[PDB]
Amino acid sequence: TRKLCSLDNGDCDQFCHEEQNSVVCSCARGYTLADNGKACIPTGPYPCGKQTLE
Amino acid sequence: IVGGQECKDGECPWQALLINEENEGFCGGTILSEFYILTAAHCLYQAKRFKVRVGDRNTEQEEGGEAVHEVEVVIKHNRFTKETYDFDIAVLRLKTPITFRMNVAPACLPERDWAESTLMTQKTGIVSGFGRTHEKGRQSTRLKMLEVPYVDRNSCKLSSSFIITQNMFCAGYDTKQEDACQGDSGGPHVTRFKDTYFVTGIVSWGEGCARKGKYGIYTKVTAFLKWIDRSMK
Ligand SMILES: CN1CCc2nc(C(=O)N[C@@H]3CCCC[C@@H]3NC(=O)c3cc4cc(Cl)ccc4[nH]3)sc2C1
Ligand SMILES: [Ca+2]
Numbered sequence: 247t248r249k250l251c252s253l254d255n256g257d258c259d260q261f262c263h264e265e266q267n268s269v270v271c272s273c274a275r276g277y278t279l280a281d282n283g284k285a286c287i288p289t290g291p292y293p294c295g296k297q298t299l300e
Numbered sequence: 301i302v303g304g305q306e307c308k309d310g311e312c313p314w315q316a317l318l319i320n321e322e323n324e325g326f327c328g329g330t331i332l333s334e335f336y337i338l339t340a341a342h343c344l345y346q347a348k349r350f351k352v353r354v355g356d357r358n359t360e361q362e363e364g365g366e367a368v369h370e371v372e373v374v375i376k377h378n379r380f381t382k383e384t385y386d387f388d389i390a391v392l393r394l395k396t397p398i399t400f401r402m403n404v405a406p407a408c409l410p411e412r413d414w415a416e417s418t419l420m421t422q423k424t425g426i427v428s429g430f431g432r433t434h435e436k437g438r439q440s441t442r443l444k445m446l447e448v449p450y451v452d453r454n455s456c457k458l459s460s461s462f463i464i465t466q467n468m469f470c471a472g473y474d475t476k477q478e479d480a481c482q483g484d485s486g487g488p489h490v491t492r493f494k495d496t497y498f499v500t501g502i503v504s505w506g507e508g509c510a511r512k513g514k515y516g517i518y519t520k521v522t523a524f525l526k527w528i529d530r531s532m533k
């Protein structure tokens with residue numbers, strides 16, 4: 247029975263950790279966690295890990 | 301890379317190229333930050349003095365975007381050993397910062413447990429380089445990429461003439477003629493997760509290129525995350 251982080255990454259965009267029995271998301275360096283606490287938002291240009299558009 | 305495809309504009313921007321005095325590429329590398337390049341330690345014996353090229357896709361022609369950077373500090377893993385290629389990982393700190401731009405940008409470092417659990421359990425990752433197009437061939441003048449499936453750890457050990465340590469992992473194809481090859485070493489192995497790319501390995505060695513029943517051997521980056529964090533200070 248896939249729970250928490252094992253079910254579709256816990257709805258997290260990047261890192262997911264099971265803390266207590268809840269999911270806690272976080273983000274690589276150069277991103278911040280959005281208000282919803284799930285999505286990761288780039289805080290500069292040229293964030294790590296993206297193919298470049300310009 | 302044997303097989304695979306060209307990296308098209310903006311597709312492999314974390315690729316670095318270690319170039320010798322003769323100014324030709326001999327090893328790849330991965331861009332971690334504006335000052336730090338990840339590479340294989342075995343690459344550090346392949347030239348007396350070297351620089352790092354970034355933003356290059358076609359080494360015959362200058363599309364304005366390339367820049368060469370000199371190396372200020374080499375940090376080889378204390379335990380690398382030529383004999384087994386165990387601990388095949390070095391960090392380079394550049395004298396001058398990389399300016400990010402089209403075709404130049406870092407790959408992300410994942411978190412250890414998430415990475416082992418989520419990234420290395422995907423089907424495939426992506427390796428890229430300017431190395432040989434066949435075992436006996438010449439280095440590619442075009443930067444190439446190739447999707448390679450993660451390989452079962454047991455299968456891999458069965459396949460290999462040599463010891464596969466806990467710091468290594470196998471990726472590649474059993475019979476399909478697709479593989480990294482000589483010159484790709486030190487280069488990135490990245491795993492995509494939802495539109496974001498994470499470093500997962502360093503191109504280390506294989507028994508020739510694309511041989512039947514043989515796989516590529518990658519340094520397991522997740523075993524070295526604390527160490528890299530330390531190297532970057
Ligand atoms: C414990 N050992 C460490 C180094 C090693 N190199 C080996 C080897 O066949 N090397 C090739 C022969 C001449 C020196 C460089 C050559 N490199 C390759 O052909 C090579 C490296 C590599 C890496 C990856 Cl990931 C896929 C294919 C591949 N082919 S076998 C081996 C085992
Ligand atoms: Ca060029």
Ligand SMILES: [Ca+2]
Nearest residue numbers: 473474511514
């Ligand atoms: Ca093979």
